[PDB]
Amino acid sequence: MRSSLAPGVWFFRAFSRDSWFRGLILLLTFLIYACYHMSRKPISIVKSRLHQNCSEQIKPINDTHSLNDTMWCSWAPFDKDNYKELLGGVDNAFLIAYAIGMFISGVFGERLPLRYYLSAGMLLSGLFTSLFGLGYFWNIHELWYFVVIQVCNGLVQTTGWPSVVTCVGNWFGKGKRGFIMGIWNSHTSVGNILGSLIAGIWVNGQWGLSFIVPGIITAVMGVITFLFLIEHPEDVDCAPPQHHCEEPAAISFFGALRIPGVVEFSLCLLFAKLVSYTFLYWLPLYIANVAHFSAKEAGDLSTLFDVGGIIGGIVAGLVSDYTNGRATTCCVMLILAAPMMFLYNYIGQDGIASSIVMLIICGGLVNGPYALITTAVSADLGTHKSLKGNAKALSTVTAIIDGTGSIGAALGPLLAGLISPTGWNNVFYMLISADVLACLLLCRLVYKEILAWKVSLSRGSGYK
Amino acid sequence: MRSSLAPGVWFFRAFSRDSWFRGLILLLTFLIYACYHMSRKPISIVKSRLHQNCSEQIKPINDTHSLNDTMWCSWAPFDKDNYKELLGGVDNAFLIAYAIGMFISGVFGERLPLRYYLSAGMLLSGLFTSLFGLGYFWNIHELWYFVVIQVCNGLVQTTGWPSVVTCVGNWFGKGKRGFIMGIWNSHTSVGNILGSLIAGIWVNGQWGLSFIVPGIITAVMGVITFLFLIEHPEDVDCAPPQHHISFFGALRIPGVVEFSLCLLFAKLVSYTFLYWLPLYIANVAHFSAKEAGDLSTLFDVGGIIGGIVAGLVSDYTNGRATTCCVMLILAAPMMFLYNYIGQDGIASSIVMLIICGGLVNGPYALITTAVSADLGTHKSLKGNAKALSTVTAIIDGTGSIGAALGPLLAGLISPTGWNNVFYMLISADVLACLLLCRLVYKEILAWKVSLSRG
Ligand SMILES: O=P(O)(O)OC[C@H]1O[C@H](O)[C@H](O)[C@@H](O)[C@@H]1O
């Protein structure tokens, strides 16, 4: 029988004091690194507007260039015949500046406080996109300026990820980490969707706003995370977590490599991100050549892949918990990838009905072990049981496991440009050549993990 | 030590639990009653739609018969020459059953608990109002349908105000004043200022969705109240507040009969501007249909400024009637000057209209506290709960007859001329100033002691 207390208040009463702060931090870390991606996005949207052919527009007065030169509807010095070399030389001066910047940000992230460092690593990321956006509103036509901004936009956005998993690893414990980090990784897709939808508004007109509006949203979130961030549970009298008297000093970069898993899970992720990039480079150069249906959907099937990543994580969390093996799940999910690329290649003769049901499963099998390794394996191998509690190593291990995975994407457009003139099918065999290297590199850790299972189950569970 | 607390956490960890539980209710009651006011506004903003002149109108294919219609751009029981009289048989047919409803709910308002009676009053007042717009899609042309939906909408929507002041009056004292209450009383103006913007979108087009959208938002705020509202602080156990027939036949004491005929005028002034101003701007101003409705929202920022300034001044000057008499005696020179020009660009329809809104809706929210401040001090003391509630019921029951003579009277004075309405709104404003001399004569004697000791 219903009585005097309201249903919403009776539901919200039953949660304890800790389970509201530990849900607050799981919301703020969801907002911050989702506001990073809509800053990273818009140059992959305005890349078809800095050059286009001038054969379908109005002809107001400019009858000088023999009525057609394709030189006036193209804005920048990306105007002449090499609009694919110099325009492609911006996403190398961002990725080199971002994959070098991670191994120094992981060293800086230890010593300085994580509220005066995530704030000054988000205002500068709102400034160095807005200075790029102001190149249209000013009289700017060069080459070195547009790349010297996009280098300094790459040393700044590396303050996001190690500080975020340091702020999350300080609260949660040994328990449901995989199933909660897998649900929590939805920000990498929410940021992509809201970074395409904002920058798609002002792309067919004046293109300065697509870099200024995310550059203001990021700087506003930079002061909200200034005013409401609680890094430690000790400050608000909560309970310290359960990673199974005063502040530990530090750790140096030479000492963090002696943790036994930090090299294999580093080096596998370079190949996992390379697979997940070269597949997305292979898919537009497939459906527009063979299986000619849905030529306009190539800009859509690239993101319906990415949704398959999210369910690729959560299902790869529920298996990682109740087996207590993280290397023995990430290896199997990449064994199952190679019998699904070939079956999609075989089944693409049919239409959309196969090209969704295979694409979702492929996204579940190759963005799974990226998502599980980049946030849950990279936090318990940070606070390993070999540190004896007197070493603060969580913003430095994440830098290694992420700064390998960014080098893994910096070599993406290079190897996808130095084999792609040799046919167009030959880029696909590199994916199968890389999945075998992804699988066979975790062998030592799977060899350790299986003999731990053989003690507790095949013997008969003696002295548990 | 090294990293201190955040400035938004160090600030929020200074407020007591009592302050958060008495802030939650001052937010929830605001968002309840603001959603009651926007169920009432779009019958005022759509009267500029039910009768268009078909002479000045684009005629593509809309001829069902030529030379004998002249009415195709009009709705059917509001198309004749009496379209300004039949709107007063609808808008008064609402405001009658809102008065007879509140005269009864002030007696039989205890047989159900507060939240089960408030959330069954935002759920049937969101149904009987979206039927008024759903009559468009079922396109019935009958005067009989636009009345029973309007007389039953008033009998439900009387469950708003008797069941908010006993939800606040338990938590934040048993009748309090101050600056936080001066902002809480702005809900009756915000519920009109956003009842015009939302319901003005679908006017030039299909006017069914000018009703069904607020009828959905009220019915959804009939669920958040059903799940989150707390009646008494005996349940969550916070700190209790600051503990501080024909009954004599229209009392011969110098209160009731010389005061009751003041709310009857000071509500008749403001409901004419609530139900006939977006037809004033639409008719004899710049000839819009939606912009004329949108310039009606600058009448309801005067209704905020005149609330805030009156609540600020009347506390620090030891008198509440002397901020009502002066602000009623000055609206009458200004409304006449507003009708004098009214058309010379959007310069004098912007700045004159706000200050005409600050001089008539400011003292709309104070002269009901003046009688409760003065008429607790009588030979019938505050211990007589059987009569101190009864005389306030008499005053507020005359106040609800003050609604039903505004839009009824405007709808009859309007077809005989349109300049005449701003003369009835002068003959009703100065008489509001005249019948507060009972309070002013006490106020002068109250200041005489401070002048003698000073
Ligand atoms: O019935 P409404 O027009 O919404 O008025 C609601 C309330 O507004 C103000 O607070 C008045 O001072 C009250 O007397 C009135 O009851």
DSSP for B94-137 reads HHHHTHHHHHHHTTS--SS-HHHHHTTTSSSTTTTTHHHHHHHH
Atom of ligand 1 nearest to the CA of B396: 14
| Chain A interface test: which of B1, B2, B3, B227 (most A C-beta within 10 Å) | B3
**What span, in angstroms and rounded, lies between the C-alpha atoms of A255 and B72?**
86
Are the beta carbons of B261 and B199 closer than 8 angstroms? no
Query: How is residue B345 written in tokens?
Result: 């660009």
The DSSP output letter for B240 is: -
Q: Scanning every residue of chain B, which has its alpha carbon at the shortest distance from the alpha carbon of A11?
A: B227
Torsion of the alpha carbons at A264, A267, A268 and A271, rounded to the nearest 10: -170
Are the beta carbons of A366 and A334 closer than 8 angstroms? yes
Helix (H), strand (E), coil (C) string for B20-67:
HHHHHHHHHHHHHHHHHHCCCHHHCCCCCCCECCCCCCCCCCCCCCCC
Are the beta carbons of A153 and A125 closer than 8 angstroms? yes
Q: Which residues of B touch A247 (CB under 8 A)?
A: 2
User: Could you give phi then psi for residue A55, rounded to 5 degrees?
Assistant: -110, 15
CA of B365 to the centre of ligand 1 (A): 7
**What span, in angstroms and rounded, lies between the C-alpha atoms of B61 and B53?**
17
Task: Tell how far CA B161 is from the center of its chain.
Answer: 11
A211 exposure class (CB count in 10 Å sphere: 0-12, 13-18, 19+): buried
| Residue keyed to tokens 């460092």 | A117
Q: What residues pair up with B74 in beta bridges, in sequence order?
A: B51
List Cα–Cα distances, A253 to A162, A257, A389, in angstroms: 14, 7, 17
Query: How is residue A224 written in tokens?
Result: 């909200």
Give the gyration radius of chain A's Cα atoms: 24
Are the beta carbons of A28 and A245 closer than 8 angstroms? no
List Cα–Cα distances, A449 to A181, A289, A387, B146, in angstroms: 22, 45, 20, 76
- DSSP string computed for A186-243: THHHHHHHHHHHHHTTTTSS-TTHHHHHHHHHHHHHHHHHHHS----SGGGT------
HSE-CB for B390 with a 13 A CA cutoff: 13
Residue with CA at minimum distance from ligand 1 atom 8: B365
- DSSP string computed for A326-366: SHHHHTHHHHTTHHHHHHHHHHTTS-HHHHHHHHHHHHHHH
The DSSP output letter for A70 is: S
Crossing angle of helices A264-282/A429-439, nearest 10°? 160
The DSSP output letter for B349 is: T
The residues near A250 (Cβ < 8 Å, ≥ 6 apart) are A110, A111, A391, A392
CA of A3 to the centre of ligand 1 (A): 31
B83 C-beta closer than 6 A to ligand 1: no
Q: What residues pair up with A252 in beta bridges, in sequence order?
A: none
Q: Scanning every residue of chain A, which has its alpha carbon at the shortest distance from the alpha carbon of B13?
A: A236
**What span, in angstroms and rounded, lies between the C-alpha atoms of A31 and A187?**
7
Phi-psi region of A337 (alpha: psi -120 to 50; beta: other; left: phi over 0): alpha
Query: How is residue B114 written in tokens?
Result: 């507060």
**What span, in angstroms and rounded, lies between the C-alpha atoms of B268 and B272?**
6
- Classify the C-alpha dihedral A349-A353-A356-A357 as positive or negative: negative
**What span, in angstroms and rounded, lies between the C-alpha atoms of B312 and B12?**
27
Query: How is residue B1 written in tokens?
Result: 């030590």
Domains of chain B (ranges; CATH) run 16-50+83-234 (1.20.1250.20), 252-454 (1.20.1250.20)
Count of H-run helices and E-run strands, chain B:
25, 0
Phi-psi region of A461 (alpha: psi -120 to 50; beta: other; left: phi over 0): left
**What span, in angstroms and rounded, lies between the C-alpha atoms of A391 and B377?**
74
B368 C-beta closer than 6 A to ligand 1: yes
B185 C-beta closer than 6 A to ligand 1: yes
**What span, in angstroms and rounded, lies between the C-alpha atoms of A22 and A28?**
10
Are the beta carbons of B349 and B338 closer than 8 angstroms? no
Q: Closest by alpha carbon to B324, among B336, B337, B311, B338?
A: B311
**What span, in angstroms and rounded, lies between the C-alpha atoms of B26 and B10?**
23
Residue with CA at minimum distance from ligand 1 atom 12: B365
| Residue keyed to tokens 């160095």 | A128
Are the beta carbons of B263 and B398 closer than 8 angstroms? yes
| Residue keyed to tokens 């310039």 | B295
CA of B320 to the centre of ligand 1 (A): 17
Q: How was this structure determined?
A: cryo-EM
Q: Which residues of A touch B14 (CB under 8 A)?
A: none
Cβ <8 Å between A230 and B9: yes
The residues near A413 (Cβ < 8 Å, ≥ 6 apart) are A88, A91, A92, A281
CA distance B266 to chain A (A): 39
Q: Which residues of A touch B231 (CB under 8 A)?
A: 4
CA distance B203 to chain A (A): 28
Give the SS3 label for residue B158: helix
**What span, in angstroms and rounded, lies between the C-alpha atoms of B26 and B186?**
12
**What span, in angstroms and rounded, lies between the C-alpha atoms of B238 and B21?**
8
Are the beta carbons of A438 and A334 closer than 8 angstroms? yes
Q: Closest by alpha carbon to A211, among A195, A225, A188, A223?
A: A195
Q: What residues pair up with B51 in beta bridges, in sequence order?
A: B74
**What span, in angstroms and rounded, lies between the C-alpha atoms of B133 and B199?**
11
Are the beta carbons of A401 and A374 closer than 8 angstroms? yes
| Residue keyed to tokens 């940070």 | A382
The DSSP output letter for A50 is: S
**What span, in angstroms and rounded, lies between the C-alpha atoms of A358 and A344?**
6
Q: What residues pair up with A453 in beta bridges, in sequence order?
A: none
Residue with CA at minimum distance from ligand 1 atom 4: B188
Residue with CA at minimum distance from ligand 1 atom 13: B365
**What span, in angstroms and rounded, lies between the C-alpha atoms of A299 and B312?**
60
Give the gyration radius of chain B's Cα atoms: 24
Task: Tell how far CA B372 is from the center of its chain.
Answer: 20
CA of A307 to the centre of ligand 1 (A): 52
Give the SS3 label for residue A87: coil
CB atoms < 10 A from the CB of A277, how many?
Answer: 19
Task: Give the angle subtended at the CA of A269 by the CAs of A268 and A270, to the nearest 5°.
Answer: 95
CA of A277 to the centre of ligand 1 (A): 64
**What span, in angstroms and rounded, lies between the C-alpha atoms of A88 and A408?**
18
Task: Tell how far CA B222 is from the center of its chain.
Answer: 20
**What span, in angstroms and rounded, lies between the C-alpha atoms of B270 and A320?**
68
HSE-CB for B250 with a 13 A CA cutoff: 7
Give the SS3 label for residue B269: helix
Task: Give the angle subtended at the CA of A72 by the CAs of A66 and A73, to the nearest 5°.
Answer: 125
B161 exposure class (CB count in 10 Å sphere: 0-12, 13-18, 19+): middle
User: Could you give phi then psi for residue A41, rounded to 5 degrees?
Assistant: -70, -55
Give the SS3 label for residue A459: coil
CA of B89 to the centre of ligand 1 (A): 24
Q: Closest by alpha carbon to A217, among A116, A118, A125, A151?
A: A125
A294 exposure class (CB count in 10 Å sphere: 0-12, 13-18, 19+): middle
- DSSP string computed for B159-195: GSSTTTHHHHHHHS-SS--SSHHHHHTTHHHHHHHTH
Q: Closest by alpha carbon to A32, among A238, A311, A226, A232?
A: A226
HSE-CB for B64 with a 13 A CA cutoff: 5
Report resolution in angstroms: 3.6
B392 C-beta closer than 6 A to ligand 1: no
3-state helix, strand, coil in chain A (%, to 5): 55, 0, 45
- Classify the C-alpha dihedral B55-B57-B60-B61 as positive or negative: negative
- DSSP string computed for A354-400: HHHHHHHHHHHHHSHHHHHIIIIIHHHTTS-TTSTTS---STTHHHH
Task: Tell how far CA B251 is from the center of its chain.
Answer: 28
Q: Which residues of B touch A8 (CB under 8 A)?
A: 227-228
HSE-CB for B335 with a 13 A CA cutoff: 27
**What span, in angstroms and rounded, lies between the C-alpha atoms of A175 and A177?**
6
**What span, in angstroms and rounded, lies between the C-alpha atoms of A335 and A319?**
16
Give the SS3 label for residue B365: coil
CB atoms < 10 A from the CB of B127, how many?
Answer: 16
**What span, in angstroms and rounded, lies between the C-alpha atoms of B246 and A425?**
98
Task: Give the angle subtended at the CA of A211 by the CAs of A207 and A216, to the nearest 5°.
Answer: 135
- DSSP string computed for B74-103: B-STT-STTTTTSSTTTHHHHHHHTHHHHH
| Chain B interface test: which of A12, A110, A230 (most B C-beta within 10 Å) | A230
**What span, in angstroms and rounded, lies between the C-alpha atoms of A363 and A309?**
5
Give the SS3 label for residue B259: helix
| Residue keyed to tokens 């319906």 | A304
Torsion of the alpha carbons at A439, A440, A445 and A449, rounded to the nearest 10: 70
Query: How is residue A89 written in tokens?
Result: 């030389």
| Residue keyed to tokens 């059917």 | B76
| Residue keyed to tokens 């975020």 | A164
The DSSP output letter for B364 is: T
3-state helix, strand, coil in chain B (%, to 5): 55, 0, 45
Q: Which of B40, B159, B161 has most ligand 1 atoms within 8 Å of its beta carbon, as the pocket-test mutant?
A: B161
Are the beta carbons of B251 and B50 closer than 8 angstroms? no
Task: Tell how far CA B295 is from the center of its chain.
Answer: 18
Query: How is residue A13 written in tokens?
Result: 């009463």
Are the beta carbons of A211 and A133 closer than 8 angstroms? yes
**What span, in angstroms and rounded, lies between the C-alpha atoms of B277 and B285?**
11
CA of A227 to the centre of ligand 1 (A): 39
CA distance A8 to chain B (A): 5
B262 exposure class (CB count in 10 Å sphere: 0-12, 13-18, 19+): buried
Cβ <8 Å between A8 and B231: no
Residue with CA at minimum distance from ligand 1 atom 16: B161
**What span, in angstroms and rounded, lies between the C-alpha atoms of B232 and B239?**
11
CA distance B112 to chain A (A): 12
Q: Which residues of A touch B227 (CB under 8 A)?
A: 6-8
- DSSP string computed for B256-285: HHHHHHHHHHHTHHHHHHHHHHHHHHHHHS
Are the beta carbons of A131 and A113 closer than 8 angstroms? no
Q: Closest by alpha carbon to A242, among A16, A464, A402, A22?
A: A22
B161 C-beta closer than 6 A to ligand 1: yes
Cβ <8 Å between B3 and A231: yes
Phi-psi region of B3 (alpha: psi -120 to 50; beta: other; left: phi over 0): beta
The residues near B352 (Cβ < 8 Å, ≥ 6 apart) are B334, B337, B338, B341
